[PDB]
């Protein structure tokens, strides 16, 4: 069965075959779309499908389907898994499996750099000490003075449950937030919670605006331990306006590298649970999101201000126009200290090159419109009116509970 | 199955029951999601008049009364005997208000009650459309006062008598291929504007010309009819602060009257229902005159702020779209021609769906249509899950007439 997707201001007609590979289900049924849902412990029982099933794609991919090194890799994983209730990927298998998670995640714009993923395995590290040293070498790595490279740390796979790798934080590097008394909020209020935890883990708080978060990384199930990046480590930008001289008075600096750390990377039945990657920011990820969402920074009111615009009524556009200015500086910044970022006009044009590419040579790519489409100028970005088809493939990177609800405490 | 959507900018939670009342497929899977694709006998007639009366009844807390049981034997009658049957009117104006309610791409539903229906069912020419189309304009413009209308002509009887209003809106500006290459006027109405003129239209061959109309009656071939001009409202676009704006010569017309589409009532269908609302601003300016495939104006615009256009990392575009935007409302506005800006239109719909979620149980939404078409995280419907499933009675797609009109 082939489908077809059309491009409405272009009329590009594609067609997707690569959805019948599609295994996982979406969520919707014949008499529901959870299209805008964000959200919509494992035996040898499953597990050597799985496992055959990814080596099935892994040696089509290198053009040896069939061959005694692929009948032998399968022989190899069956006993390894009927005697070890597990297996082990080759580091070949685990590049493969990392760069096609990335491949498959249908809800990231930034697919045109899937394939230039640099894959750092950890899977030989058992402390929180030693994740801390692998994660300061994947932020100097990936930061590499403002020229960004995309790189994933991968620590070892879950066993029972009872002994899992996380990274406590939602990304390597992040604001703290601090609830005030009086109900305000000093800080990212996306992160009042993890600070709680690390501040009660020990974590002597600056109580600043902008502090960066410690990092809190669990080891073979081991309760969480503290560490803060070297400074040195954290590239951060200052944030000023190419025409107001009054937006660096402001004060407000973000930190260059986006380093996702809480996910969960599958890879033929395996699970890695601490799986940190990063590229780099697209701007409104920073302009629109980070600082002008109500539920974060939300510096919308007083950059209106400061322009004197007309805030009296809506119909002004002057949360509109305010953003833009925000966006504009946010862009200005990190060109001019040269930290990689990129437009979303630049980003989902990329994107659509990629998609017809992907449709080409592989027949789909799954995509997911809602988060595709930019938070800001949505229609005048080509994905706007782009049809996508969202399926679910593996390799994949998942969401999993925040580990403080899971994990059982040791003391 | 009693499914919940979060809103994560206040954590609000609704519980939707309504899906489980849902009967049409969505084009989805649980293999594959279909949320951004744009358009997805005697005998199945009586189960769906049952499903419409029984609703009926049951909204005005008569569900198992005689009058219920009576209507129900009675329309099962005309289905037995003549093949098919009529709505009365309180049914008729019941379908339509409910047709908008249901319809899950629209941001504007918290208006739906208020909905003028004009029972045009017995209209049988060209000539009586056009005046029933006259009346509707004339009621709806209401001297830049909008106010919500759907004018219902004659259901479908067997695809040879069908009535259709062959364009796409009521007000349309027309647009043509110019041996230059480009085009002038609207490039969405390229091949319409070509059929007006392939029909006997004389085109004034500007930029902002109404078309005419071209209505079909019981399915004869369709009649060229000019709108009288001082029927439609026109705005001027110019901007609160640049005195440049007015020089770039834009309109945009006050009545946004959709009159493609079909509409479905208990297995009965209309397939002539224009109906008209009013607008949010993004429709004329970020779609209307922003778009690749539309007036595409942004560059002038940008030009004549000088604006650096050299790299698209200036957000000149952004830029521009915003002040577009802002002059569309601001036209409209001093004008005293009624139009919603996107942020109070999609506060009205979170609104709506709370009162949905609390009074009838949910609120189907199509979260890729609800969000404007700019500055989307910024309105409260950004981060409000939907649910998107179809209920009826409905508005549904139907072929342009030009391709299935036995000509
Ligand atoms: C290199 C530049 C990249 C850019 C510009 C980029 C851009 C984005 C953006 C804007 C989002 C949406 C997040 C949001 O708006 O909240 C996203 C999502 C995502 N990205 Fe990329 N990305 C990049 C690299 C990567 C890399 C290296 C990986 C993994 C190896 C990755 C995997 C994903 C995944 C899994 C999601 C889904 C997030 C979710 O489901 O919540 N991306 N990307
Ligand atoms: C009164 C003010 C109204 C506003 C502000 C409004 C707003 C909108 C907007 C912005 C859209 C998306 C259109 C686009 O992006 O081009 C839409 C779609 C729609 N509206 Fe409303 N609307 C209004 C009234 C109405 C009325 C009176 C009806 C019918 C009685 C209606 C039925 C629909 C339908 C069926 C769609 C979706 C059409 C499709 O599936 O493509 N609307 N509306
Ligand atoms: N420039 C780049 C480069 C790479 C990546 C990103 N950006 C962004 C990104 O995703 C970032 C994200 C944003 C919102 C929600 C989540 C999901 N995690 C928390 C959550 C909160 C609320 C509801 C559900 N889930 C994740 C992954 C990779
Ligand atoms: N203010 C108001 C008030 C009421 C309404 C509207 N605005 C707008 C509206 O419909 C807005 C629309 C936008 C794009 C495409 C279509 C559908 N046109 C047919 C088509 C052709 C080709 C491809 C896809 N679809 C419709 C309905 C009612
Ligand atoms: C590809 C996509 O289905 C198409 O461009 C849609 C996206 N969302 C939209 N949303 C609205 N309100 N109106 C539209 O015309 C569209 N177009
Ligand atoms: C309700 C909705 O699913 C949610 O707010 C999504 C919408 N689309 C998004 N798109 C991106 N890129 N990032 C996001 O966080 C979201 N949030
Ligand atoms: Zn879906």
């Known amino acids: 069965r082939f489908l077809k997707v059309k491009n409405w201001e272009t009329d590009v007609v594609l067609t997707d075959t690569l959805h019948l590979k599609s295994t996982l289900e979406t969520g919707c049924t014949e008499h529901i779309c959870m299209g ?29 389907f069939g061959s005694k090194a692929h009948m032998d890799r399968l022989e190899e994983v069956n006993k390894e898994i009927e005697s070890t209730s597990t297996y082990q990927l080759k580091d070949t298998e685990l590049i493969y499996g990392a760069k096609h998670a990335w491949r498959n995640a249908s809800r990231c714009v930034g697919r045109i750099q899937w394939s230039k993923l640099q894959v750092f395995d950890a899977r030989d590290c058992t402390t929180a000490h030693g994740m801390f040293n692998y994660i300061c070498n994947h932020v100097k790595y990936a930061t590499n003075k403002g020229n960004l490279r995309s790189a994933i740390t991968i620590f070892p796979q879950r066993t029972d449950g009872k002994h899992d790798f996380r990274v406590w934080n939602s990304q390597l590097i992040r604001y703290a937030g601090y609830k005030q008394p009086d ?14 935890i690390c501040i009660q883990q020990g974590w002597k708080a600056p109580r600043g605006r902008f502090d960066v978060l410690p990092l809190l990384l669990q080891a073979n199930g081991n309760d969480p331990e503290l560490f803060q990046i070297p400074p040195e480590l954290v590239l951060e930008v200052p944030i000023r306006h190419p025409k107001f001289d009054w937006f660096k008075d402001l004060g407000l600096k973000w930190y260059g590298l986006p380093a996702v750390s809480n996910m969960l990377l599958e890879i033929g039945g395996l699970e890695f649970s601490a799986c940190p990657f990063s590229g780099w920011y697209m701007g409104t990820e920073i302009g629109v999101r980070d600082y002008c969402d109500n539920s974060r920074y939300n510096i919308l009111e007083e950059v209106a201000k400061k ?14 126009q305010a953003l833009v200015e925000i966006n504009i500086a946010v862009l200005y910044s990190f060109q001019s200290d040269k930290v990689t970022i990129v437009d979303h006009h630049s980003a989902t044009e990329s994107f659509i090159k990629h998609m017809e590419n992907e449709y080409r040579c592989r027949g789909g790519c799954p995509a997911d419109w809602v988060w595709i489409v930019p938070p800001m100028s949505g229609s005048i970005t ?16 998942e969401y999993q509970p925040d580990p403080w609800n899971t994990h059982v405490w040791k003391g």
């Open 307 to 320: 322009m004197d615009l007309d805030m009296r009524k809506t119909s002004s556009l002057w949360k509109d």
């Open 382 to 397: 080509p994905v706007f009116h782009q049809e996508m088809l969202n399926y679910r493939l593996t390799p994949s990177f």
């Open 183 to 196: 109900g305000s909020t000093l800080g990212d209020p996306a992160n009042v919670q993890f600070t709680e």
């Open 36 to 64: 805008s849902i964000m959200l919509p412990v494992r035996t040898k029982d499953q597990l050597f499908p799985l496992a055959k099933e990814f080596l099935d794609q892994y040696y089509s991919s290198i053009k040896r």
